[PDB]
Structure formats: C-alpha cells, structure tokens
C-alpha cells in the first residue's frame, strides 16, 4: 500500500512490472523515477508504455525534456529533467493534465513536483539485478499499490 519492492535480473522483467503498473493507471497520476545512468528508469517507461497499448517507440527523451505519446489508452508524458539546466516549459499543464506523467531524475525539480507522487527507485545490485522500490506518496498512491500488489 505504502511501500513495495522488486529484484529483477533482466530488463523483461523490469519491463514487465511497469506493464502491470499501467493497468490501474488513472489521469492525474504522476511517477517518478530516480536511479543511476543506466539503472533502467526509461526500460521501465518503455514497459509502462507497452501497458497503456503505445506501440510506437518510446525512447530516452533526455534531450527534449519531455515527450508526449497519446494512441494509449492514456496519454503518456514522458519527462527527463537531467538537462533541465539547459533549458518556461511549463510542466505543470502535464502533471495536472488528464494523461500519467514518469518523470526521470525528478528530485532535481523537487520544488516543481506535485505534493503527492508515486516515486519509483531502480537501485544496481549487480550486472543485470536491479532492486526496484515503490513508495507511494498520497491516497491516491496508495490505493494505486494496493491494487498492483493485490493482482500481483
Ligand atoms: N534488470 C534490468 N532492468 C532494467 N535495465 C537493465 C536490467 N539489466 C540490464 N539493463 C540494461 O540497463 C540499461 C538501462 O538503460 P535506461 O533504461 O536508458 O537507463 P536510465 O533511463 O535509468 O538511464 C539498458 O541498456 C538495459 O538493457
Ligand atoms: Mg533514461
């Protein structure tokens, strides 16, 4: 409900999670995703996409900050605010909108974060094997991980 946590020792199943994530899914919601270069944060989100029935590419949007995806069943805002010192985008139309925003390396804009958020870890733990938390952080959450580890 509050709290829950993953190993995983291959990028499927990182995928796979985020896919599960995506069913209960609801306008409004925002993740965010903290990890390393590398850690899987966007595998995650290509996952999630697959989840909400996205079949085009979804790829690394580090360069634009942010990429819009809306044949889902959801419109997904892709965000990645690690050049965010580079760039006013007005992100809070997203974060509010009616579509579910993953935001990559989200703590650096902490400030501009929406008070209740799913946050999502992706921690190395050897080669291949990552340790993925959730921690939900609003009713909303929290109703959001009971369900997923209900269906689990
Ligand atoms: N268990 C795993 N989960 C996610 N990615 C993994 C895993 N094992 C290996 N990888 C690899 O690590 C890389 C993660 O890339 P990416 O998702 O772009 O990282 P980030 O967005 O966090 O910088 C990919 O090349 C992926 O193939
Ligand atoms: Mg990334």
Redesign the pocket.
Same mark, same amino acid.
């Given at each position: 409900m509050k709290q829950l946590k993953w190993r995983?020792?291959?990028?499927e =199943?990182? @995928?796979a999670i985020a896919k599960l994530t995506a069913a209960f899914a609801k306008p409004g919601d925002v993740l965010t995703?903290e +990890? #390393?270069? +590398?850690? +899987? @944060?966007? /595998?995650? /989100? @290509?996952g999630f996409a697959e989840g909400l029935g996205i079949t085009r590419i979804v790829n690394?949007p580090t360069f634009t900050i942010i990429k819009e995806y809306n044949d889902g069943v959801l419109p997904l805002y892709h965000m #990645?605010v690690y050049r965010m010192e580079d760039e006013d985008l007005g992100l809070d139309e997203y974060f509010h909108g009616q579509g579910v925003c993953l935001v =990559?390396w989200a703590h650096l804009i902490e400030e501009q974060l929406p008070q209740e958020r799913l946050q999502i870890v992706?921690k190395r733990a050897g #080669? #291949?094997?990552?340790e993925?938390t959730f921690t939900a952080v609003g009713n909303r959450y929290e109703m959001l991980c009971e369900e997923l580890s209900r269906h689990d």
């Amino acid at each position: 409900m509050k709290q829950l946590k993953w190993r995983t020792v291959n990028p499927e =199943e990182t @995928k796979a999670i985020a896919k599960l994530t995506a069913a209960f899914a609801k306008p409004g919601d925002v993740l965010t995703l903290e +990890g #390393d270069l +590398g850690a +899987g @944060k966007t /595998t995650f /989100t @290509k996952g999630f996409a697959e989840g909400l029935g996205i079949t085009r590419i979804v790829n690394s949007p580090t360069f634009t900050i942010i990429k819009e995806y809306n044949d889902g069943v959801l419109p997904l805002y892709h965000m #990645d605010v690690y050049r965010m010192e580079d760039e006013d985008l007005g992100l809070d139309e997203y974060f509010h909108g009616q579509g579910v925003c993953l935001v =990559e390396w989200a703590h650096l804009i902490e400030e501009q974060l929406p008070q209740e958020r799913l946050q999502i870890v992706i921690k190395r733990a050897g #080669d #291949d094997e990552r340790e993925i938390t959730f921690t939900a952080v609003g009713n909303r959450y929290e109703m959001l991980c009971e369900e997923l580890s209900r269906h689990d």
